[PDB]
Design a protein around this ligand. Structure first.
Ligand SMILES: NC(=O)c1ccc[n+]([C@@H]2O[C@H](COP(=O)([O-])OP(=O)(O)OC[C@H]3O[C@@H](n4cnc5c(N)ncnc54)[C@H](O)[C@@H]3O)[C@@H](O)[C@H]2O)c1
Ligand SMILES: NC(=O)c1ccc[n+]([C@@H]2O[C@H](COP(=O)([O-])OP(=O)(O)OC[C@H]3O[C@@H](n4cnc5c(N)ncnc54)[C@H](O)[C@@H]3O)[C@@H](O)[C@H]2O)c1
Ligand SMILES: NC(=O)c1ccc[n+]([C@@H]2O[C@H](COP(=O)([O-])OP(=O)(O)OC[C@H]3O[C@@H](n4cnc5c(N)ncnc54)[C@H](O)[C@@H]3O)[C@@H](O)[C@H]2O)c1
Ligand SMILES: NC(=O)c1ccc[n+]([C@@H]2O[C@H](COP(=O)([O-])OP(=O)(O)OC[C@H]3O[C@@H](n4cnc5c(N)ncnc54)[C@H](O)[C@@H]3O)[C@@H](O)[C@H]2O)c1
Ligand SMILES: Cc1c(S(=O)(=O)Nc2cccc(CN)c2)sc2ccc(Cl)cc12
Ligand SMILES: Cc1c(S(=O)(=O)Nc2cccc(CN)c2)sc2ccc(Cl)cc12
Ligand SMILES: Cc1c(S(=O)(=O)Nc2cccc(CN)c2)sc2ccc(Cl)cc12
Ligand SMILES: Cc1c(S(=O)(=O)Nc2cccc(CN)c2)sc2ccc(Cl)cc12
Lengths: 267, 267, 267, 267
């Protein structure tokens, strides 16, 4: 078991197609003992996580709530038992209001909306690190989820800016985590058909946005030398588990591309 | 004259060592007709700009003030005359509260402070573009100031995150500006001894911060194959003028490194 | 005149659609005095260059010929007059045998062929620098031509590898040239319809290769926020002249993208 | 066992401090069955590999020898048994003559020497892929060793150019290997005290070269958020094994940085 005996906190489950759901599943298959955090609809999240291979304690965490962050370490310790620390943390959280992502023109996003998205999608990575590093073991691992923002693209708009910020945050979190013997890295995944993503392809954010995602999905599988299957999150979940294991011991402040190789190819 | 007959808006002058002061000077030496914008201390800014080679109208612009942005194009047109448009825009604006930049630990920056800095240093680039593109000529140029944030560094902290966001914003501003025949690019400069920078070297942001900047300055000149003189902003001002001219007509969404070549060298 | 009084050596003219032909034309329009070098078909090259706005001495240079390189500086000094030095050098040279570029499978290129292409397309940039730096003025400029090789693409094959090598060579040439007060940079251009390029679109290197270039050309104009016109080399020639001028004085070991911004955009 | 039942070819062992020796050791500890290839001093290599945890067949391979490459697959099949294929290939080979690496000036490397180094260090990655892909299983993995060449550095000189070429080769090998269901990636390691490296620190390539490596080693550990121990190759060996396993299933044409995070940090 790749993660045997490791204690790992996984945020970001909201449905059974959430990337963090599959991260949580693969980690439990590999012997990890999990603690879960969920935002807002905790009864729904509980019913979703009941389908994980093993039962895992669920804690409430709204990343914009200072009280939630201040109590987090104590509530984690209460779930895993005093004297036990975390070996791994998974940040799988993201949000941008509709004004900053979609067919709404890039210039029309109010900063209040953009700021909320950068708060939840980028700053929260440092927030969670700060809350959880004091209860992490040496040799631990923090992993966040990324979507390659080094080039601009239709519709993603302000969320691409939030991703650019998150990659920069990750390189500073790595400097802090290094003082604990802890690594911090991001996994840049290719497009995955989550519920939200499926809703956008169906036009939830405007028809242009939906058409552009479909073109991006299609271009992705074409470019990827090993193909890309947007309906299979297993590859991304296994990559996260790789970074949570002891088998990338010299990688930190970095980005692993679980994208089928698409970013290495022009056409 | 490299910029003869061009009408160009320059923001960001606060003292005579501001990078935008030298941008403004070099552009006037090259035949440009300028309109200036200043924030807060407008009487001070006016007295500073009285020393530019030619007189230039000064307009008030706080980039966080929605009314200032809504009136900007009209006030620009009133200064340059109806029927005249802008050929160039210079964004030379930046700010991060002391909690996000310096010896204060990276985790201790409140998001309210970080958000203010990302607002003024990154989002304002899109804000100004939105305000000014409707009064820009085809073949125009928007230029912002950048400090290479692709690797983390001591003390810069949250401001590095703001720079990462600004580079991403620039690639989307380029998509909008392209509809106008307008380019958008950033100039990534090496360290320059502005008043603020000199204050930090003297310890305004804590002694550790001051020592780290000095080490970064020293490493910069060493790495740069043509040297780097932190007391000479002329090189950065000439680079901005290059991008405002017609001599980089196929460069947009991009970053020009006016850093002595330091970013191309390891040691 | 952007280049008034500057003495500049331009290699790489073979027909009137060569990128170096337009570089040479724009530089002469901007007051530069040129010395030309040509390979192999010198009578043809002479007849082509007779159409430049001004007459320019033509020197023979095969970059694989050690005797040609050993005599180059002396022959340049004889053309521009003793006591005069060069202010600028343009490397616009490239070649890969058909086995390393096209529909021939990537694995089937013999190393002898690949090595010849890397010799002429990458190593020759250091070769020319070595020959010409001792007769270059402080404040001089060396410019090479590049095609963005940071991602793989169909058909370009071994020539992409040669471009990757040339970018690396450029960063070391900059270290040598810095000792002379001389900059060294590359211009990464978008696809241009040279004779060779047109021949490939017509199938000279196999039908698959021809179809892939056409798709790459089409994707380029789409991605470029300001468009890309593959039949107009003026934009690339003006960019080279920008780097030969005094208006990028702090850029070296670097790459300027004269590609319409296409490399900054995903779709 | 991370690599249980996997059959893996490992090149590049020459002493017990070779990176490939530790790759071979860690892979055998993780249940892999190995086939080894060695160059030139095969009796020495055999005596070195006698100390691996398990015995492994040794095959002769000079990567510049066309007959060696033409027979390789057949000799591999004879060692692992007909009907068995390879699951993994490790390229751990590199060489640059003293004229292209060290205190000898960058311009003084003859192309014959540079070409030999690019042949053995870069082209050989495609050569081995071509020889071995027809005897690789779907889901297989090819891994090469890299040293981050994206910025220039003292002394490494032409070998940095060879690394730049190898990264480009890797992105095309990935396109070929994808047709087989096979991944291809590089591991960019921090400096490791091999015999050759120790000899250079002791002055084998000139005193300046030796002093610059020591400064690069020291800067590396400083920059690395988790530290860098140049005398421990275990971290790099475990990273290679990660890529040979099934736990990075969506990564290809890519580069994993096993460098302590040093490349993500400026100072
Ligand atoms: N689907 C993709 O294509 C893709 C690709 C790359 C990266 N990612 C990244 O994966 C991550 C997870 O998204 P997802 O795709 O799986 O979708 P998702 O919708 O399933 O999950 C997002 C989660 O963010 C959480 N969240 C939102 N606001 C929160 C808040 N204040 N506090 C705490 N949690 C909050 C949500 O509750 C939700 O669980 C994102 O960071 C996303 O950007 C997704
Ligand atoms: N000095 C350097 O080393 C260096 C290097 C690279 C980039 N830059 C960049 O150059 C730019 C200018 O800074 P500077 O160095 O010249 O220093 P500066 O202090 O002189 O100028 C900064 C200006 O930002 C303006 N500003 C702050 N808040 C503003 C607001 N709400 N609204 C409008 N304007 C506001 C200030 O008034 C000031 O004029 C920055 O963007 C900075 O990050 C500086
Ligand atoms: N057309 C494009 O799309 C494009 C894009 C980017 C970069 N470039 C680059 O521009 C440069 C010039 O090519 P081009 O497009 O203009 O085509 P070209 O065919 O017109 O010019 C190439 C020149 O290389 C010279 N050359 C070949 N072997 C030589 C040798 N041994 N010694 C000296 N000179 C030799 C040729 O004589 C010729 O003048 C190339 O380096 C090329 O890779 C071209
Ligand atoms: N030591 C480091 O710091 C470091 C860092 C990053 C990458 N690498 C890379 O690791 C790899 C291995 O080198 P090393 O450090 O372990 O040193 P090494 O000297 O131990 O190994 C190099 C091997 O290359 C082989 N080789 C040379 N010519 C060959 C040829 N014609 N045919 C077949 N094999 C040939 C040698 O026999 C030797 O086994 C290199 O590719 C190297 O560039 C090393
Ligand atoms: C959403 C999205 C992604 S994402 O899933 O990677 N990021 C993300 C952002 C916000 C909220 C969430 C969680 N529901 C995730 S890529 C891409 C490309 C084009 C478009 Cl229009 C959208 C997207
Ligand atoms: C300030 C700063 C720069 S900066 O001048 O480029 N950016 C900037 C940020 C904020 C406000 C301003 C305008 N006064 C400018 S680099 C660098 C490296 C280390 C440190 Cl501690 C600081 C800096
Ligand atoms: C040729 C070529 C270029 S190039 O013009 O940039 N480079 C080059 C290479 C070799 C010889 C020359 C000079 N005739 C130029 S890009 C691209 C993309 C796909 C394909 Cl199939 C080809 C090309
Ligand atoms: C050698 C070397 C490396 S290397 O080990 O990564 N590459 C390599 C090259 C050639 C032959 C081998 C195998 N003996 C390995 S980095 C670095 C930095 C500075 C200097 Cl002077 C040297 C080096």
């Amino acid at each position: 078991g790749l993660l045997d005996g490791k204690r790992i906190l996984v945020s970001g489950i909201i449905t059974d197609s959430s990337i963090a759901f599959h991260i949580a599943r693969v980690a439990q298959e590999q012997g990890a003992q999990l603690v879960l955090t969920g935002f807002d609809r905790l009864r729904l999240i509980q019913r979703i996580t009941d389908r994980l291979p093993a039962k895992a304690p669920l804690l409430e965490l709204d990343v914009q709530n200072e009280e939630h962050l201040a109590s987090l370490a104590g509530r984690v310790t209460e779930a895993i038992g005093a004297g036990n620390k975390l070996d791994g943390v998974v940040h799988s959280i993201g949000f941008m209001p509709q004004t900053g992502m979609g067919i709404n023109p890039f210039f029309d996003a109010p900063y209040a909306d953009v700021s909320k998205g950068i708060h939840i999608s980028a700053y929260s990575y440092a927030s969670m690190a700060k809350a959880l590093l004091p209860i992490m073991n040496p040799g631990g691992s923090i992993v966040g989820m990324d979507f390659d923002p080094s080039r601009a693209m239709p519709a993603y708009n302000w969320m691409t800016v939030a991703k650019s910020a998150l990659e920069s945050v990750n390189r500073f979190v790595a400097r802090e985590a290094g003082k604990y013997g802890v690594r911090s890295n991001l996994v840049a995944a290719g497009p995955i058909r989550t519920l939200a993503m499926s809703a956008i392809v169906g036009g939830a954010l405007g028809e242009e946005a939906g058409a552009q995602i479909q073109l991006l999905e299609e271009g992705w599988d074409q470019r990827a030398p090993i193909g890309w299957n947007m309906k299979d999150a297993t590859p991304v979940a296994k990559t996260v588990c790789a970074l949570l294991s002891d088998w990338l011991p010299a990688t930190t402040g970095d980005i692993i591309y679980a994208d089928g190789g698409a970013h290495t190819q022009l056409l």
